[PDB]
Structures are given as C-alpha cells and as structure tokens.
PDB file of C-alpha atoms and ligand atoms in Angstrom:
ATOM      1  CA  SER A   1     -67.082 -22.612 -32.195  1.00 44.37           C
ATOM      2  CA  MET A   2     -65.041 -24.042 -35.132  1.00 45.70           C
ATOM      3  CA  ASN A   3     -66.070 -27.095 -37.152  1.00 45.50           C
ATOM      4  CA  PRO A   4     -64.098 -30.307 -36.655  1.00 42.82           C
ATOM      5  CA  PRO A   5     -62.867 -32.422 -39.531  1.00 45.49           C
ATOM      6  CA  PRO A   6     -65.831 -34.374 -40.920  1.00 44.62           C
ATOM      7  CA  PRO A   7     -66.372 -38.057 -40.147  1.00 44.48           C
ATOM      8  CA  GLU A   8     -64.292 -40.445 -42.216  1.00 46.83           C
ATOM      9  CA  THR A   9     -65.812 -41.390 -45.607  1.00 44.97           C
ATOM     10  CA  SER A  10     -62.725 -42.975 -47.257  1.00 44.14           C
ATOM     11  CA  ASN A  11     -60.213 -45.461 -45.861  1.00 44.88           C
ATOM     12  CA  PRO A  12     -58.596 -47.804 -48.406  1.00 50.36           C
ATOM     13  CA  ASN A  13     -57.366 -50.159 -45.648  1.00 52.01           C
ATOM     14  CA  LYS A  14     -60.850 -50.654 -44.132  1.00 51.10           C
ATOM     15  CA  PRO A  15     -62.225 -53.903 -45.623  1.00 52.06           C
ATOM     16  CA  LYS A  16     -65.475 -53.471 -47.560  1.00 47.78           C
ATOM     17  CA  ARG A  17     -68.464 -55.456 -48.812  1.00 46.51           C
ATOM     18  CA  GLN A  18     -71.243 -54.927 -51.378  1.00 45.95           C
ATOM     19  CA  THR A  19     -74.268 -56.832 -50.108  1.00 45.33           C
ATOM     20  CA  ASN A  20     -78.000 -56.940 -50.563  1.00 46.27           C
ATOM     21  CA  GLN A  21     -78.604 -55.386 -47.097  1.00 46.93           C
ATOM     22  CA  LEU A  22     -76.210 -52.490 -47.828  1.00 46.38           C
ATOM     23  CA  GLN A  23     -77.809 -52.028 -51.262  1.00 44.52           C
ATOM     24  CA  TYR A  24     -81.201 -51.747 -49.493  1.00 42.75           C
ATOM     25  CA  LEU A  25     -79.783 -49.166 -47.070  1.00 45.25           C
ATOM     26  CA  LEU A  26     -78.852 -47.003 -50.102  1.00 43.64           C
ATOM     27  CA  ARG A  27     -81.714 -47.666 -52.529  1.00 44.31           C
ATOM     28  CA  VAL A  28     -84.550 -47.714 -49.942  1.00 42.99           C
ATOM     29  CA  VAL A  29     -83.456 -46.227 -46.605  1.00 43.17           C
ATOM     30  CA  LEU A  30     -81.153 -43.344 -47.572  1.00 45.42           C
ATOM     31  CA  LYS A  31     -83.130 -42.479 -50.712  1.00 47.74           C
ATOM     32  CA  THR A  32     -86.463 -42.369 -48.784  1.00 46.95           C
ATOM     33  CA  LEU A  33     -85.096 -40.036 -46.106  1.00 46.01           C
ATOM     34  CA  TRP A  34     -83.022 -37.914 -48.538  1.00 47.70           C
ATOM     35  CA  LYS A  35     -85.994 -36.926 -50.724  1.00 48.71           C
ATOM     36  CA  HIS A  36     -88.222 -36.008 -47.733  1.00 48.99           C
ATOM     37  CA  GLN A  37     -89.234 -32.373 -47.173  1.00 52.90           C
ATOM     38  CA  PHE A  38     -87.459 -32.412 -43.768  1.00 54.99           C
ATOM     39  CA  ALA A  39     -84.144 -33.823 -45.050  1.00 53.99           C
ATOM     40  CA  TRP A  40     -82.364 -30.521 -45.712  1.00 53.33           C
ATOM     41  CA  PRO A  41     -80.842 -29.892 -42.217  1.00 50.60           C
ATOM     42  CA  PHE A  42     -79.441 -33.465 -42.224  1.00 49.73           C
ATOM     43  CA  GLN A  43     -77.914 -33.583 -45.756  1.00 47.45           C
ATOM     44  CA  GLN A  44     -74.432 -32.421 -44.668  1.00 48.84           C
ATOM     45  CA  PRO A  45     -72.370 -32.170 -41.464  1.00 51.63           C
ATOM     46  CA  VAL A  46     -73.571 -29.586 -38.939  1.00 53.68           C
ATOM     47  CA  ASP A  47     -71.829 -26.329 -39.859  1.00 50.83           C
ATOM     48  CA  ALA A  48     -71.534 -24.732 -36.430  1.00 49.55           C
ATOM     49  CA  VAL A  49     -70.142 -21.500 -37.953  1.00 50.06           C
ATOM     50  CA  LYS A  50     -72.885 -20.990 -40.545  1.00 51.77           C
ATOM     51  CA  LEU A  51     -75.643 -22.029 -38.112  1.00 51.67           C
ATOM     52  CA  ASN A  52     -74.217 -20.115 -35.099  1.00 50.17           C
ATOM     53  CA  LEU A  53     -74.042 -23.218 -32.867  1.00 52.10           C
ATOM     54  CA  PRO A  54     -70.768 -22.448 -31.077  1.00 49.85           C
ATOM     55  CA  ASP A  55     -71.364 -25.186 -28.450  1.00 49.63           C
ATOM     56  CA  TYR A  56     -72.502 -27.955 -30.846  1.00 46.83           C
ATOM     57  CA  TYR A  57     -69.162 -29.823 -31.013  1.00 47.92           C
ATOM     58  CA  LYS A  58     -68.538 -29.200 -27.293  1.00 43.99           C
ATOM     59  CA  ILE A  59     -71.568 -31.461 -26.717  1.00 42.47           C
ATOM     60  CA  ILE A  60     -71.684 -33.757 -29.785  1.00 42.97           C
ATOM     61  CA  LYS A  61     -68.537 -35.901 -29.961  1.00 44.77           C
ATOM     62  CA  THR A  62     -69.751 -38.466 -32.538  1.00 44.19           C
ATOM     63  CA  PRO A  63     -71.166 -36.272 -35.310  1.00 42.81           C
ATOM     64  CA  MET A  64     -73.150 -37.884 -38.108  1.00 43.60           C
ATOM     65  CA  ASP A  65     -75.331 -36.714 -41.004  1.00 45.14           C
ATOM     66  CA  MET A  66     -76.938 -38.139 -44.138  1.00 42.58           C
ATOM     67  CA  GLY A  67     -74.352 -36.484 -46.434  1.00 38.50           C
ATOM     68  CA  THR A  68     -71.707 -38.588 -44.702  1.00 40.13           C
ATOM     69  CA  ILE A  69     -73.933 -41.706 -44.804  1.00 41.12           C
ATOM     70  CA  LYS A  70     -74.647 -41.153 -48.521  1.00 41.09           C
ATOM     71  CA  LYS A  71     -70.884 -40.900 -49.241  1.00 44.80           C
ATOM     72  CA  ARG A  72     -70.212 -44.004 -47.138  1.00 49.17           C
ATOM     73  CA  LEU A  73     -72.880 -46.007 -49.014  1.00 46.46           C
ATOM     74  CA  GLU A  74     -72.017 -44.702 -52.518  1.00 49.71           C
ATOM     75  CA  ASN A  75     -68.265 -45.253 -51.906  1.00 48.20           C
ATOM     76  CA  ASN A  76     -68.763 -48.773 -50.326  1.00 48.31           C
ATOM     77  CA  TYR A  77     -67.258 -47.736 -46.959  1.00 46.57           C
ATOM     78  CA  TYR A  78     -69.128 -50.332 -44.898  1.00 48.38           C
ATOM     79  CA  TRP A  79     -68.586 -53.987 -44.083  1.00 49.48           C
ATOM     80  CA  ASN A  80     -72.139 -54.573 -42.804  1.00 54.54           C
ATOM     81  CA  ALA A  81     -75.620 -53.062 -42.478  1.00 56.29           C
ATOM     82  CA  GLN A  82     -75.341 -52.649 -38.653  1.00 58.24           C
ATOM     83  CA  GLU A  83     -72.533 -50.062 -39.178  1.00 57.95           C
ATOM     84  CA  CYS A  84     -74.811 -47.959 -41.398  1.00 57.28           C
ATOM     85  CA  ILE A  85     -77.894 -48.404 -39.184  1.00 55.19           C
ATOM     86  CA  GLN A  86     -75.730 -47.176 -36.273  1.00 59.03           C
ATOM     87  CA  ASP A  87     -74.805 -44.037 -38.280  1.00 59.57           C
ATOM     88  CA  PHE A  88     -78.496 -43.191 -38.768  1.00 56.68           C
ATOM     89  CA  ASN A  89     -79.184 -43.741 -35.066  1.00 58.16           C
ATOM     90  CA  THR A  90     -76.197 -41.574 -34.099  1.00 59.07           C
ATOM     91  CA  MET A  91     -77.567 -38.788 -36.320  1.00 58.09           C
ATOM     92  CA  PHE A  92     -81.015 -38.915 -34.682  1.00 53.80           C
ATOM     93  CA  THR A  93     -79.625 -39.195 -31.130  1.00 52.93           C
ATOM     94  CA  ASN A  94     -77.294 -36.234 -31.633  1.00 50.55           C
ATOM     95  CA  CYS A  95     -80.246 -34.086 -32.685  1.00 49.63           C
ATOM     96  CA  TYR A  96     -82.303 -35.162 -29.647  1.00 53.54           C
ATOM     97  CA  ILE A  97     -79.377 -34.532 -27.273  1.00 54.05           C
ATOM     98  CA  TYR A  98     -78.391 -31.111 -28.606  1.00 56.80           C
ATOM     99  CA  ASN A  99     -81.851 -29.568 -29.025  1.00 55.39           C
ATOM    100  CA  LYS A 100     -84.942 -28.958 -26.852  1.00 51.56           C
ATOM    101  CA  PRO A 101     -87.969 -31.315 -27.004  1.00 48.31           C
ATOM    102  CA  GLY A 102     -90.447 -30.276 -29.711  1.00 48.39           C
ATOM    103  CA  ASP A 103     -88.006 -27.880 -31.466  1.00 49.43           C
ATOM    104  CA  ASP A 104     -88.522 -27.820 -35.236  1.00 51.02           C
ATOM    105  CA  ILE A 105     -85.266 -29.737 -35.902  1.00 51.32           C
ATOM    106  CA  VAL A 106     -86.387 -32.451 -33.386  1.00 50.79           C
ATOM    107  CA  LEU A 107     -89.813 -32.855 -35.080  1.00 50.29           C
ATOM    108  CA  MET A 108     -87.941 -33.141 -38.392  1.00 48.31           C
ATOM    109  CA  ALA A 109     -85.627 -35.856 -37.022  1.00 50.61           C
ATOM    110  CA  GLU A 110     -88.625 -37.682 -35.511  1.00 52.27           C
ATOM    111  CA  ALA A 111     -90.429 -37.754 -38.883  1.00 52.04           C
ATOM    112  CA  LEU A 112     -87.304 -39.075 -40.641  1.00 52.89           C
ATOM    113  CA  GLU A 113     -86.769 -41.623 -37.849  1.00 56.00           C
ATOM    114  CA  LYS A 114     -90.349 -42.910 -38.235  1.00 54.72           C
ATOM    115  CA  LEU A 115     -89.633 -43.675 -41.912  1.00 55.86           C
ATOM    116  CA  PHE A 116     -86.215 -45.135 -40.997  1.00 52.97           C
ATOM    117  CA  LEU A 117     -87.806 -47.526 -38.473  1.00 54.93           C
ATOM    118  CA  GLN A 118     -90.423 -48.673 -41.000  1.00 55.56           C
ATOM    119  CA  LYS A 119     -87.733 -49.392 -43.608  1.00 55.11           C
ATOM    120  CA  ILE A 120     -85.400 -51.161 -41.102  1.00 56.36           C
ATOM    121  CA  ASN A 121     -88.329 -53.360 -39.986  1.00 51.90           C
ATOM    122  CA  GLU A 122     -88.313 -54.640 -43.642  1.00 53.24           C
ATOM    123  CA  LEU A 123     -84.500 -55.042 -43.887  1.00 52.90           C
ATOM    124  CA  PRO A 124     -84.057 -57.921 -46.387  1.00 55.75           C
ATOM    125  CA  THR A 125     -82.736 -61.318 -45.333  1.00 55.82           C
ATOM    126  CA  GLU A 126     -78.955 -61.627 -45.977  1.00 57.06           C
ATOM    127  CA  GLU A 127     -78.387 -63.534 -49.251  1.00 58.16           C
TER     128      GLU A 127
HETATM  129  C1  QGN B 201     -78.671 -31.439 -37.512  1.00 59.12           C
HETATM  130  C2  QGN B 201     -78.844 -30.252 -36.659  1.00 59.12           C
HETATM  131  N1  QGN B 201     -79.056 -30.539 -35.322  1.00 59.12           N
HETATM  132  N2  QGN B 201     -79.272 -29.640 -34.417  1.00 59.12           N
HETATM  133  C3  QGN B 201     -79.461 -28.378 -34.824  1.00 59.12           C
HETATM  134  N3  QGN B 201     -79.761 -27.296 -34.097  1.00 59.12           N
HETATM  135  N4  QGN B 201     -79.916 -26.195 -34.884  1.00 59.12           N
HETATM  136  C4  QGN B 201     -79.566 -26.560 -36.115  1.00 59.12           C
HETATM  137  N5  QGN B 201     -79.513 -25.633 -37.097  1.00 59.12           N
HETATM  138  C5  QGN B 201     -79.288 -27.951 -36.163  1.00 59.12           C
HETATM  139  C6  QGN B 201     -78.960 -28.931 -37.130  1.00 59.12           C
HETATM  140  C7  QGN B 201     -78.771 -28.635 -38.588  1.00 59.12           C
END
C-alpha cells in the first residue's frame, strides 16, 4: 500500500546523447500527449496512497509515467529514442494490465496511445 521510490531520472554515470530523434520525442511526442485533456492521470508517478490503490505496486513492477519521461527528456537521461519509446509503452501497458477493459483510465491511455503511435510513425530519420 506504500509508494516505492520513483523510477530513476538522474544518473551521472549513465552515458547520454542529445539527438534529433530524442529532440522529437520531447518537442513533438511528449508535448502532444502532455497538453491533451486526458494527460492528467499520467503526469506523475501513480500515488497509490492518494488514489487508494493498495495493490498497484504489488502488480506493477516497472512503473512509468509522463512526469518521469518529461524529466528524463529535459535532463538528457537517454542514450537513444528506443529507450524513451519503451518508457511510453511501459506506461500504457501498466495501465492496461492494472485496470479493467473500458475503464475511464484505460480509454484515456488508449487516446494518448493513438496520438503516440501517429507521432512515432513519423519519427525523423537519424541525422
Ligand atoms: C496511471 C493510473 N493507472 N491506473 C489507475 N487506476 N486508477 C487510477 N487512479 C490510476 C492511474 C492514475
């Protein structure tokens, strides 16, 4: 029923890059999903105490959220775009695992994922 430590967003010994694909993941992908009317449940780690989800972290062992992704992008945490794309997919999958089909949070994730997929289809060529 307690919250775990959040996912890592800082690690000075992890090697980093600033690349056109990662810039697209911030400027297009994250910004598109973040401004959406359904973003709010996904803008920070799941707070199992506040939201009365005492079993969430019993079930979800690889937590992820757009607040974490935003910090990772803004603080140049990544080496490559695949790492960030995986974080988005982990976030959506966790929601689909934890919740019932057609629940409001699942419809919200699905709408964000539809936009995500459209933007990833247009991921720029690596320069
Ligand atoms: C991301 C997330 N996923 N599953 C959920 N179930 N109920 C919630 N409040 C909730 C949230 C915020």
